[PDB]
Design a protein around this motif. Structure first.
Motif, short mmCIF file in Angstrom:
data_model
loop_
_atom_site.label_atom_id
_atom_site.label_comp_id
_atom_site.label_asym_id
_atom_site.label_seq_id
_atom_site.Cartn_x
_atom_site.Cartn_y
_atom_site.Cartn_z
N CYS A 41 2.11 -2.29 -0.44
CA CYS A 41 3.35 -1.55 -0.24
C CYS A 41 4.02 -1.98 1.06
O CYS A 41 3.38 -1.96 2.12
N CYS A 87 4.56 1.50 3.79
CA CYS A 87 3.45 1.94 4.64
C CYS A 87 2.57 0.79 5.11
O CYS A 87 1.87 0.94 6.11
N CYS A 124 3.21 4.07 -4.64
CA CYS A 124 2.19 3.58 -3.72
C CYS A 124 1.02 4.56 -3.65
O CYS A 124 1.22 5.78 -3.62
N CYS A 179 1.40 6.19 0.41
CA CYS A 179 2.63 6.89 0.81
C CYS A 179 3.45 7.39 -0.38
O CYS A 179 4.45 8.08 -0.16
#
Ligand SMILES: [Zn+2]
Ligand SMILES: [Zn+2]
Ligand SMILES: [Zn+2]
Ligand SMILES: [Zn+2]
Lengths: 423, 418
Positions: free
Chosen positions: A238, A241, A260, A263
């Motif tokens: 991701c 994050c 994700c 996050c």
């Protein structure tokens, strides 16, 4: 009025073809079910081949076929044609109809250029239409020989099992090319028996790849893995994050992403396309990456960690690095990469496989080597840990190929040696 | 048809209290992960320095006759009734309690009589409950509690959407733990991090006091992947147990997909309780003993919080002893477990990554100060992951985040030219 004829007038067959699309049954055409309860690892049945096509079966015809191939390359290698022709000449009329009625992608296919050329150059008596039919029955129904590299094997009952990327049955070769079919999982009477049409070198890869591998049998796989909402073999790091995984999934040509894992953000479609480009770039790089140049593979792995989080490409890089470090005697980093491999496979493909079993066994090897660099007296704890891995290998191989198979007895041998060195 | 008396009615039906702490809170704006939602000052910070005379009294009545709740709770409640204006005294008394009607306890009437205070017993009692069910432990001071107004309006979740940390002057800094859209609910964990990684039965046990059976996304999940036993058929896969209404069922084994019988389930529940008992007598000051217990525990557990606890004990024991080799393995298993059962950002996971970085760096440095690039990069990755999570949890400029990022940039600085 834009009618050219009365719309109720009967259509010609070409005109019907303009309106509708026939789909032929997905290969290999049939399903197979167990009549009894099966515990994992138990034999379902053992089957002798319909035919084992080996050069040894007819080397006259083999030399002829290889020389035809050397003059003008032929679309399918010579083995397929030896298999087909020997299937039309060497078996009984009944055996024959057993293979001619097996599944084929194009039942009405006209004889290919290659087929007519072989018929005329080798001067054989078999019907071109059946020659074509048979080359595809073995293209889509046979198994590669165990040892001989230009060899293939066909069975009758084995072809009745449908494909699954999470197969209910596993198999291995017996001594006289016998096909030993075992239950891979615990099964109840009436449960379906499936095998993987796709090799183990691709089974750990993502849904798009596996589907590409089985498209030849003319279906888009919708097995339990292939239809899962999350393709956890296709995880990207991701970018929001920087640490969680977003799993991509392609259906009907469109790619979406899970949120994700950390996050819970969804990537935009632009980010999805960006990371698809990254994905293809690293798939390309994999063909140029291998264990004979470990510095290069280290470079590629470092760059790839920024893109991937639990992805089969990253697993491949872990594999290259593990084999390179193991060959170089570097147990320390080989250990890390092997543990990442175990993590990946047990998340993505948790059922018993030779890949997973030998991941556990080779982890045992690596840990034992690293420990023995401190002296032969390895502490109990470490021993136990090592033993555990060996045991796990054993436990899986026991299911895949039986108690007394050479693989199983090898893993169990290492395990019991470990126990022998315990206080 | 004659009316029932109240005890007759109570025999037939069961009333459900508003679950603590009684309210829900929602964000009015989109929030990026790690963004501050708000910062709140305490209604009151109950510490001994708030009223040292009252504290000394409190102490001595406790040492004569032990109080059911320690003195700091009474300091908090009394001082809430004495030192707050009428406006804030009402915000405290308005807070959720399990027993609105509860008569003054004997501890309360005693403290009233021997400290000679003018506060009404029933309020005293109720204030106790308030502080017991709405306050937080002080950051620094043992025997310290802090109570906030708005923070108490967040419902509990074992997978909270918000995280928090103390700022200067006991400020409560509330951050978004995940990406959130306007209208999404803000939840925090009423459970400490020492229990968040454990199984659903345990977490529910830990929130029972707020009078609800947790049905958050983790507790209501079909599979409790924090409660995984080693399949006795295959010897290698995991079967995850789940308890609902006192009855335990199991998922199919991850590998052989067999279901255990009720007999096997009860057997392994007995094993589970035995190892939970053994955990209390197992710790890092006796590593050989923990090794024994771990070796026996691997036959029972496959992916279970008890096994994670043993991995933790062994990692800390080996780390303290300078055995980077074994600590490495157990820390990797810890990361595997936590990232499976509790994947969202937590201090536990962040410091798992950071301490994995420490362990691998130590291990590498046993071969020389010049650590190869590859190893450095891997180590750096771990540090970076720690940074990434702490960034979300407590901000870019927090001491924790800065520490992880410092280790990371140091790692990059040690990289060779090529
Ligand atoms: Zn599939
Ligand atoms: Zn993320
Ligand atoms: Zn919960
Ligand atoms: Zn099992």
């Amino acid at each position: 009025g834009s009618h050219m004829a009365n719309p109720l007038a009967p259509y010609t067959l070409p005109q019907i073809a303009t309106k509708v699309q026939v789909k032929h049954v997905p290969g290999k055409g049939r399903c197979l079910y167990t009549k009894h309860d099966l515990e994992p690892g138990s034999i379902i049945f053992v089957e002798t081949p319909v035919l084992v096509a080996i050069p040894s079966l007819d080397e006259e015809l083999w030399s002829v076929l290889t020389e035809i191939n050397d003059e003008e390359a032929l679309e399918l290698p010579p083995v397929w044609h030896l298999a087909a022709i020997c299937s039309l000449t060497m078996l009984d009329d009944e055996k024959k109809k057993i293979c001619l009625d097996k599944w084929v992608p194009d039942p009405d296919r006209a004889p290919s250029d290659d087929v007519l050329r072989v018929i005329n150059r080798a001067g054989l008596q078999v019907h071109p239409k059946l020659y074509e039919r048979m080359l595809m029955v073995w293209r889509y129904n046979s198994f590669g020989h165990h040892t001989e590299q230009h060899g293939l094997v066909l069975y009758n009952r084995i072809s009745m099992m449908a494909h699954s990327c999470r197969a209910t049955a596993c198999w291995h070769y017996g001594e006289d090319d016998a096909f030993i079919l075992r239950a891979r999982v615990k099964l109840q009477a009436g449960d379906e028996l499936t095998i993987s049409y796709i090799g183990d070198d691709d089974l750990f890869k993502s849904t798009n790849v596996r589907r590409e591998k089985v498209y030849g049998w003319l279906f888009t796989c919708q097995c339990v893995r292939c239809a899962a909402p999350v393709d956890n073999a296709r995880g990207f790091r991701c970018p929001l994050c920087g640490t969680g995984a977003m799993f991509f999934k392609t259906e009907d040509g469109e790619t979406t992403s899970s949120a994700c894992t950390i996050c819970q953000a969804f990537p935009t479609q632009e980010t999805i396309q960006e990371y698809l480009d990254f994905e293809q770039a690293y798939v390309d790089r994999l063909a140029e990456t291998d264990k004979s140049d470990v510095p290069d593979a280290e470079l590629v792995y470092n760059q790839a960690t920024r893109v991937f989080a639990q992805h089969w490409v990253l697993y491949q890089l872990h594999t290259i690095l593990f084999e390179g470090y193991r060959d170089a005697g570097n147990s320390e980093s080989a250990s890390f990469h092997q543990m990442e491999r175990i993590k990946y496979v047990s998340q993505v493909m948790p059922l018993a496989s030779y890949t997973l079993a030998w991941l556990y066994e080779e982890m045992g090897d690596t840990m034992l080597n690293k420990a023995e660099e401190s002296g032969p007296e390895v502490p109990a704890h470490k021993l136990n840990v090592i033993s555990r891995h060996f045991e796990d290998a054993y436990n899986l191989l026991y299911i895949l190929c039986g108690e007394d198979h050479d693989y199983t007895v090898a893993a169990g041998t290492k395990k019991t040696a470990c126990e022998e060195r315990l206080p």
